[PDB]
């Protein structure tokens, strides 16, 4: 009975080493090393094994330390020497990380040399309080019409991308990352958004394909990729979201704006559950520990919009959660839905019905709402949202709607037109003015005479036309952020003449 009551320790005490800054492995198994001694070690402090592996002191017990290993178990044997490092876990931060692919500890895994950063930051700092914050007011543009119109995200919000497997969540995140190139290239310094993609428990092939996709779109020069893949130790997959959050909190603290994607938090909760079950912490529902909500909530509260006295920067978080058969009442989906400010919900039936991105607008919500929109998108999207809600009220009457009154048939028609308008192709985010022009064409009624099969082609052709020959009205809408009455008349003229000439 007793971890430290091993016969060797007892006979060494009977016979009559520094047990303050140094320890000895009593037992090692499944990534958990019980360490004797280390009487001066702190909770959550990084330690050092004799083989060079690092650990973290999670369980401080009366006679042993429960240390989680940042690597493989085979390099640790009973009796190995453990050292203190005297420090809580910290990562490097700065602009030196933009364009790099690092692991959960800020070590480059792309071969492009060492991260030449000068600043380090603790991964477990507390979020900003009540007073340092201000209300979420500026739009975070994703370039996706359905998101930007019906589920708008602001700078400082925490919007959950939730859905089953293979529904398009990573694609939404990657389109959002690719979109910010227009702002990061231009000169307006407070529309610039730096991105952090945290890959948690994925294939290395998947992250390689993602980094290639971001390099082809020239989105890597302002993106940090943190990857704790599937073959990494559960401590690394547990720590990667906090590393990414500190990398983004650097920007949030220095007057800049960052966006972070946790892809995904389900796998991080699974890694944490493994670490906790092996440390023999009391399991709860689905064997998850008691403080897994605390885990994800103290991770997600660190995304904040700061007031002007604190630099005015922000950190926007887009956590990803995979549900099993649409079950949002599972433990971790429930926690993360409770923590965030709204959720972009993706469906499989919407996916295979031709609706891509498969955003379920009935189930999706943004609690920040229109405060996170521009006045032009606000104008058009209020009408679009009302009309789509009305369509959803009577969408069940479709396949019989030809035998219903003119009001129902018009609701059905306008709804099918707007639904065909919200479709979008992959890796092609739109500017907000172009989205405004397309939604304007849709909600003002210049598509009710058109066939549903032709709405996509009309939208593509009209967008090409207005981008080529109407940069003036586009620039006006973009610079003023609203559709002025002169701009409204010009839009009306453009759309009516195009529809006249359209095939």
């Amino acid at each position: 009975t007793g971890t430290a009551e091993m016969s060797s320790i007892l006979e060494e005490r009977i016979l009559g080493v520094d047990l303050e800054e140094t320890g000895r492995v009593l037992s090692i198994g499944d990534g958990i090393a019980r360490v004797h001694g280390l009487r001066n070690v702190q909770a959550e402090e990084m330690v050092e094994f004799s083989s060079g592996l690092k650990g973290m002191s999670l369980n401080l017990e009366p006679d042993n330390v429960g240390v989680v290993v940042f690597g493989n178990d085979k390099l640790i044997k009973e009796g190995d020497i453990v050292k203190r490092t005297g420090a809580i876990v910290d990562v490097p931060v700065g602009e030196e990380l933009l364009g790099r692919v690092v692991d959960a500890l800020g070590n480059a895994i792309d071969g492009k040399g060492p991260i030449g950063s000068k600043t380090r930051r603790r991964v477990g700092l507390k979020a900003p309080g009540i007073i340092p914050r201000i209300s979420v007011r500026e739009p975070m543009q994703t370039g996706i019409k359905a998101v930007d119109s019906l589920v708008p995200i602001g700078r400082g919000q925490r919007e959950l991308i939730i859905g089953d497997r293979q529904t398009g969540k990573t694609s939404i995140a990657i389109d959002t990352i690719i979109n910010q190139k227009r702002f990061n290239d231009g000169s307006d310094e407070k529309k610039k958004l730096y991105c952090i993609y945290v890959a948690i428990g994925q294939k290395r092939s998947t992250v390689a394909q993602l980094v290639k996709r971001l390099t082809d779109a020239d989105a890597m020069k302002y993106t940090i990729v943190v990857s704790a893949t599937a073959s990494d130790a559960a401590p690394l997959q547990y720590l990667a979201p906090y590393s990414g959050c500190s990398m983004g909190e650097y920007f949030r603290d220095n007057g800049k704006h960052a966006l972070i994607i946790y892809d995904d938090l389900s796998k991080q909760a699974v890694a944490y559950r493994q670490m906790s079950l092996l440390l023999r912490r009391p399991p709860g529902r689905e064997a998850y520990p008691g403080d897994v909500f605390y885990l994800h909530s103290r991770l997600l509260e660190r995304a904040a919009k700061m007031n002007d006295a604190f630099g005015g920067g922000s950190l926007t978080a887009l956590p990803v959660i995979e549900t099993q058969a649409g079950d949002v009442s599972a433990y971790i989906p429930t926690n993360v839905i409770s923590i965030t400010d709204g959720q972009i919900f993706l469906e499989t039936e919407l996916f295979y019905k031709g609706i891509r991105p498969a955003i379920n607008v009935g189930l999706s919500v943004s609690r920040v709402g229109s405060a996170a929109q521009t006045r032009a998108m606000k104008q058009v999207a209020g009408t679009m949202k009302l009309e789509l809600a009305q369509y959803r009220e009577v969408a069940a009457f479709a396949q019989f709607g030809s035998d219903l009154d003119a009001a129902t048939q018009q609701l059905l028609s306008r709804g099918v037109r707007l639904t065909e308008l919200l479709k979008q192709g992959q890796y092609s985010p739109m500017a907000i003015e172009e989205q405004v022009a397309v939604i304007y064409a849709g909600v003002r009624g210049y598509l009710d005479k058109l066939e549903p099969s032709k709405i996509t082609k009309f939208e593509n052709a009209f967008l090409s036309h207005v981008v080529s020959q109407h940069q003036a009205l586009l620039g006006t809408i973009r610079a003023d952020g609203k559709i002025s009455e002169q701009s409204d008349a010009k839009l009306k003229e453009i759309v009516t003449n195009f529809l006249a000439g359209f095939e």
């Binding site: 009487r39 001066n40 070690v41 702190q42 909770a43 959550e44 402090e45 999670l58 369980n59 401080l60 017990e61 009366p62 429960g66 809580i88 477990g124 507390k126 979020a127 900003p128 309080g129 009540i130 007073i131 914050r133 201000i134 209300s135 979420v136 400082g156 919000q157 440390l279 912490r281 009391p282 709860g284 529902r285 520990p289 008691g290 403080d291 909500f293 605390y294 909530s297 103290r298 509260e301 660190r302 904040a304 919009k305 009442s329 429930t334 409770s338 923590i339 400010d341 919500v365 609690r367």
Partner: protein, 456 residues
């Protein structure tokens, strides 16, 4: 008494005392930290060791680090100086406006009022809101479930209840942010500042805020409701007021208790809830009651997991609820504010023996005509058109302009007394205004304002 940390496992810390073991529920002070860390005793493990739960993060804790016994449970500043301020679970200010300079402190753990301190007949708490006071009235010292979340004016109704209980009854309010989002806590603070309920310049603040954030350990989220209840207890027992206490959210209070109980190694009960679910809820809720000095009325936001009303958390909360206010979006998109659903809001004191035969009959008639009108809408005769007209007028007359919306909407706010509500709905039901247009009742106070709007 000085102790030393012997174990740190997450948010659970074991502290060994070599003399003077502290009782259970005592707060301990961890020494040598840059921020105040407080541990609350949970068990006596034997061998002079107690097991505690932390109120803040435990990173950087060392075995052997000295821990001081406070000598009492968590003590928070209580007084009129807490009004308009924000404090966390352990009573320190989190709004950066300086210390809270009250004269006395109260422990957040207290026994409920005794048997002989209880009021023996139920009275009504008049809020000045027409739909609430009429159809689903609140009882003094009762618990009210507030259903409906975002987009239905929950914060406007909260602030209007604060304002109306401050004006009509002279009783202050306490808001407890149990598991609050920090963004929405900042939002609430600033909406309360802009609606005058909080005043940063003089002592006319009407509400005290207690925030237990979502990024705090489960112990803090399990005790923030007690902190708010302790402030409200002060206002009731020392100043004989009728206090309002808001607990948003109560499901998060249950969830934090479940998490704390799981951290302490206790075997979960049904659906994963703490085995002590009913007794935790009871020890909290029984302090919300009418005593002989004053009363504490509690509006509590209910979240229902999986829309399952037989879930243990709602089923245990519903055993204490005396009323229910359902904020419906089908009522808000209809144009009515406050968006209270008049057919789904209930009350236990909607009983002739409690509110009087006249009140009961007016309320029953209003509800019956609204149900009839829903039926008639479902089919769209002789007098059914008149029922439709009277029910549209009743629907409009349930609306009301609020004082906390005056700066934004421009309309004056109305605090309708109970008799004026009863008689106005009675008259509309009898037919005394079957000639006036239905939009002469929309967004007015008493029925005299309806006839005055019909004149124009």
């Amino acid at each position: 008494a000085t102790g030393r940390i012997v174990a740190v496992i997450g948010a659970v810390v074991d502290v060994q005392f070599d003399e003077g073991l502290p009782p259970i529920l005592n707060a301990l002070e961890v020494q040598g930290r840059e921020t105040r860390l407080v541990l609350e005793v949970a068990q006596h493990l034997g061998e002079s060791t107690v097991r505690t739960i932390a109120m803040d993060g435990t990173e950087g804790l060392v075995r052997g680090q000295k821990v001081l016994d406070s000598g009492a449970p968590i003590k928070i500043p209580v007084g009129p100086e807490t009004l308009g301020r924000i404090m966390n679970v352990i009573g320190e200010p989190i709004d950066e406006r300086g210390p809270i300079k009250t004269k006395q402190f109260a422990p957040i753990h207290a026994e409920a009022p005794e048997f002989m301190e209880m009021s023996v007949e139920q009275e009504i708490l008049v809020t000045g809101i027409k739909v609430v006071d009429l159809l689903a009235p609140y009882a003094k010292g009762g618990k009210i479930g507030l259903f409906g979340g975002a987009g239905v004016g929950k914060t406007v109704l909260i602030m209007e209840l604060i304002n109306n209980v401050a004006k009509a009854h002279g009783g202050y309010s306490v808001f407890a942010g149990v598991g609050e989002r920090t963004r929405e806590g900042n939002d609430l603070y600033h909406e309360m500042i802009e609606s005058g309920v909080i005043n940063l310049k003089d002592a006319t603040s009407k509400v005290a805020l207690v925030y237990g954030q979502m990024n705090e350990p489960p112990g803090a989220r399990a005790r923030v409701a007690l902190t708010g209840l302790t402030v409200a207890e002060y206002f009731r027992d020392q100043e004989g007021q009728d206090v309002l206490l808001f607990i948003d959210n109560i499901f998060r209070f249950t969830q934090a208790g479940s998490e704390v109980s799981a951290l302490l190694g206790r075997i979960p009960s049904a659906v994963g809830y703490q085995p002590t679910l009913a007794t935790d809820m009871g020890t909290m809720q029984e302090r919300i009651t009418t005593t002989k000095k004053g009363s504490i009325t509690s509006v509590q936001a209910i979240y229902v997991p999986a829309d399952d009303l037989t879930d243990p958390a709602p089923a245990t909360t519903f055993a204490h609820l005396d009323a229910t206010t359902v904020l419906s979006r089908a009522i808000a998109e209809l144009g009515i504010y406050p968006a209270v659903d008049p057919l789904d809001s209930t009350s236990r004191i909607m009983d002739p023996n409690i509110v009087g035969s006249e009140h009961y009959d007016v309320a029953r008639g209003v509800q019956k005509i609204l149900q009839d009108y829903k039926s008639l809408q479902d089919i769209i005769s002789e007098e059914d058109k008149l029922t439709v007209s009277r029910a549209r007028k009743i629907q409009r007359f349930l609306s009301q302009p609020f004082q906390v919306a005056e700066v934004f909407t421009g309309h004056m706010g109305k605090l309708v007394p109970l008799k004026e509500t009863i008689k106005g709905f009675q008259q509309i039901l009898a037919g005394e205004y079957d000639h006036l247009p239905e939009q002469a009742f929309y967004m007015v106070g008493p029925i005299e304002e309806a006839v005055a709007k019909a004149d124009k």
